[PDB]
């Protein structure tokens, strides 16, 4: 999972965003981001 001297989770994510280079992974909530987001523009 890290192979390090570290502890717990508070950095990963923010690198996660760099590290990761394979779109390839669908999921339900992603269409909620759009038609929701849609509202956000006003509602």
Do not use: W
């Not at 923010?14 to 006003?42: C, G, S, W």
Request: glycine share 2%; no cysteine.
């Amino acid at each position: 999972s890290k192979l390090e001297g570290s502890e717990d989770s508070l950095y990963s994510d923010y690198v996660d965003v760099f590290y990761n280079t394979k779109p390839y992974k669908h999921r339900d909530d992603r269409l909620l981001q759009a038609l929701m987001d849609i509202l956000n523009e006003e509602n």
